[PDB]
């Protein structure tokens with residue numbers, strides 16, 4: 001069968017935490033007062049919830065309310081426990097309260113409100129400096145959750161809220177986040193298509209924090225190259241082909257061979273043979289001001305097939321790309 005894998009950092013963080021820390025199934029929710037929050041407007045709807053802008057009438061502060069769809073079960077406690085474990089950490093969204101919604105008959109999570117600019121408008125205005133700055137801010141959030149034994153598993157532009165006025169960033173939607181336990185096999189049906197790591201796309205279940213680093217690399221590529229998303233697959237199979245057209249097929253084979261993984265045979269008629277490309281080919285007159293040798297080297301070190309070969313969040317924060325960012 002497949003060769004096992006372990007995280008190269010924070011491997012045993014949960015192993016040595018009290019059981020209450022990671023055993024979310026036994027978590028007892030502490031309920032707030034549902035009457036404290038008045039819904040103002042629907043912001044949107046996901047497969048798992050509806051999100052509302054609201055006012056906390058005990059301080060007249062704006063907040064956001066995520067009313068969970070009855071979609072799934074102990075997933076609710078998992079998200080709640082993770083939010084509580086990570087609360088107060090750098091750039092982690094703050095869960096302010098949890099109340100029982102009387103209409104949905106489900107829990108409603110109340111989060112701090114971020115006056116953000118949607119990524120669909122923001123990304124085309126970001127300067128070279130902004131990209132490095134905000135990347136560093138995401139890395140703070142990722143090193144924090146990884147150091148706390150948690151992988152996000154859904155890093156993507158929508159989940160990184162940015163208040164461009166106050167230069168403030170929050171990583172949100174921990175609904176797919178999980179605790180890392182060495183040797184544990186995880187569901188590969190996480191992350192948005194364009195941000196799925198090769199490990200998910202080849203159906204390798206013993207993955208780790210390094211998944212988030214692939215996703216971050218996908219975000220970086222889309223920002224510095226001005227192509228969002230960067231790997232634009234039509235389905236999960238084509239997604240791997242898109243990746244292989246850039247990183248090349250020989251290294252994909254080296255990857256699956258290392259872990260004694262077999263590709264889905266459906267790739268036999270679609271994958272082809274592809275050389276690894278140099279990143280410079282994606283540079284052109286309209287994005288060159290966002291590209292530097294430092295950016296290309298950093299991106300190159302995030303986007304590796306082998307999840308064990310990717311930069312960790314902490315290592316990423318040491319990269320020359322961030323030397324120009326004010327500390």
Ligand SMILES: O=C(O)c1ccc2c(c1)nc(Nc1cccc(C(F)(F)F)c1)c1nc(NC3CC3)ncc12
Pocket residue numbers: 043044045046049050051053064066093111112113114115116161172173174
């Ligand atoms: O899941 C969580 O952890 C979580 C935490 C915090 C927020 C959040 C989700 N979603 C928000 N917005 C949003 C907008 C459109 C669509 C959807 C969707 F999810 F798709 F329904 C959500 C949101 N918006 C703001 N401020 C915006 C300027 C009012 N602040 C915080 C959040």
